[PDB]
Design a protein around this ligand. Structure first.
Ligand code: 6NI
Ligand code: CA
Ligand code: CA
Ligand code: CA
Ligand code: CL
Ligand code: CL
Ligand code: CL
Ligand code: CL
Lengths: 356, 361
């Protein structure tokens, strides 16, 4: 196995693909160098064209060491690789390296069949994930909440994320008629998928199987296993009939929350909201008996009520909305609230109240 | 005690005096004092203090208290730009109001705030901020971290003739830097504690305001703009850099960045713990090799200026990298003796900073 390639062409591929699971699989075949990283749950494959003389073959090498070497070489560098027994030789200028190898044959492979396919701007996928990813659970015993629902319905792709205390849902049109379908992508997979998307205008092809998802953009192919379990139905989480409607400036609301939070309990940070005619009062207190109060002029209709919220849950929403004005739809002091950008119904958020 | 101050006049003073910040509650508080038209803010860790003076152009009333530093800073920072911050002491609480935002903070008496003893300066001088930044940045990285030999956890500041000098070492490597001050000074040699060196750096804004320094037998003080920093000194006897510099060290000269990157790349395949690289010096060439127990090998060859006998010497590549990163110059001189002796390293263009790294077996 031999190739010579510009450092420049290896950088993004290496970034994307970065004991045998600490190794990258390198394969030369049909004028192409393919680089594959895997943790057994997911895999990333990047391809680089080879124009300079090359010889087919494959090995695996330490991923971080190999990446660090290539990134460590100067800009403009040319990188020459040859496989020599149990070692891989890497050469550029008067820099030389010999890396240990494990056989290509020992490298783990994820086959499976595609059931649902569609193309969409990578930008639309980014929007969907950014809108909801912060509401994923992290290490819940309910594994299926440690990730994100991808659902196709009509001509929309929808994401849903929840940790049982707050929920996020976002839908975007993809311009073609789709079968009704839903799968859970593990949180690590959502993160890796998001990292593959750079905000250029670039089509993304998505293929979904019974147990896998695959995404192709440019010269990259990401494949992950799915998480198998029953995801909650966002439609049963949305408040069925909120009759109290609050509208306020996004930034004013965010900053009032953040300031009041300073004097909340540091271990479980929440604030009390009192809504009344034209007005919102946010309050906090702590074990030192310190107290914060914020008063805001707001658009409000409905009965006066008091309700508490976890600060981080509300700030997380306001930070995802990046809105001018936000709508909060309330029911009563013991029910969850629905939060939305006053000027967009692409996304919605539902947050449990907190007792204080 | 009462004052009203615009948000942005309070923000950097609060950030600065919080520098030394907890073991007991009052140590997480700032001292606020209104007196003779000035708000003073003080934070301390019992070893050092940072004090800020902020002038009061709005109505105020004298008095003093202490309040939690982080809460008070976070409140001020979180208020809208140009927010007028009104403060009033009310016994065991201090009330903060701006627009329709209100905060109540728990106080501890100003009289219980620890207060560094009065002391007498024996030497005083002024110097540009840029000079102090250069002295500290040149040597800070070589200070020990949590060593049982406490005096090594600090930085030696030495005045001698027309020069201010810093020295730092952890027993394994040493850094020394001297700069002119255009003023004759008595001989003093003092150890500044770890966090004090950090505070000194932190107060240098990078404008044209000079730095005024005062040193006594047991204390050091630095004034910049409207900030006064004071630290107690570490009460030990620091090693003498003069006696650690190699007696008579073969001369190698090389581009700093070419050297840095070659060491950086070789280090990738150096032992994970011991970080050993081998240097082979030969006629106008340096060869750097690293290998680990996996028997992966790195080799970098560089063109350098060298005329001496060929030799092999091992180094902790991290120590060498630290030196090259602190030098930030075009060319470096490495001054060698033999394979079991330290190397001295310097900017090829200046003897103001010198570095001593011991070889590894
Ligand atoms: O009541 N809620 O706001 C709420 C939020 C998230 C989840 C997830 N499963 N059930 C939920 C209910
Ligand atoms: Ca992977
Ligand atoms: Ca190139
Ligand atoms: Ca103002
Ligand atoms: Cl290519
Ligand atoms: Cl080699
Ligand atoms: Cl939706
Ligand atoms: Cl593809």
């Amino acid at each position: 196995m031999k190739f010579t390639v510009e450092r420049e062409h290896l950088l993004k591929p290496l970034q994307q693909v970065s004991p045998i699971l600490g190794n990258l699989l390198l394969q030369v075949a049909d004028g192409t160098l393919s680089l594959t990283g895997t943790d057994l749950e997911m895999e990333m494959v990047a391809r680089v064209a080879l124009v300079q003389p090359h010889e087919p073959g494959a090995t695996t090498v330490p991923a971080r060491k190999f990446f660090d070497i290539c990134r460590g070489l100067p800009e403009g560098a040319e990188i020459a690789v040859q496989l020599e027994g149990e070692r891989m030789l890497v050469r550029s200028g008067r820099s030389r390296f010999s890396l240990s190898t494990l056989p290509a044959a020992d490298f783990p492979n994820l086959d499976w069949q595609s059931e649902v396919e569609f193309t969409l701007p990578q930008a639309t996928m980014k929007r969907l994930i950014e809108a909801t990813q912060f509401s994923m659970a992290h290490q819940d015993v309910r594994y299926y909440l440690n990730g994100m629902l991808f659902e196709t319905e009509g001509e929309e792709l929808r994401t849903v994320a929840t940790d049982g205390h707050r929920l996020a849902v976002c839908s975007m049109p993809i311009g073609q008629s789709l079968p009704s379908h839903s799968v859970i992508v593990p949180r690590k997979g959502v993160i890796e998928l998001m990292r593959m998307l750079d905000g250029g205008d670039n089509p993304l092809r998505v293929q979904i199987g019974s147990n896998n998802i695959r995404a192709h953009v440019g010269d990259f192919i990401f494949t992950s296993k799915l998480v198998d379990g029953r995801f909650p139905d966002y439609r049963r989480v949305l408040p069925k009939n909120p009759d109290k409607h609050l509208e306020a400036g996004c930034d004013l609301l965010k900053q009032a929350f953040a300031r009041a939070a300073i004097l909340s309990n540091e271990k479980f940070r929440g604030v009390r909201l009192y809504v009344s005619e034209n007005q919102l009062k946010i309050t906090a207190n702590n074990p030192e008996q310190e107290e914060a109060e914020e008063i805001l002029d707001v658009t409000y209709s409905g009965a006066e009520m008091e309700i508490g919220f976890n600060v981080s849950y509300v700030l997380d929403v306001l930070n995802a909305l990046k809105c001018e004005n936000v709508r909060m739809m309330l029911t009563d002091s013991v029910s969850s609230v629905q939060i939305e950008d006053a000027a967009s119904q692409s996304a919605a958020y539902v947050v449990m109240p907190m007792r204080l």
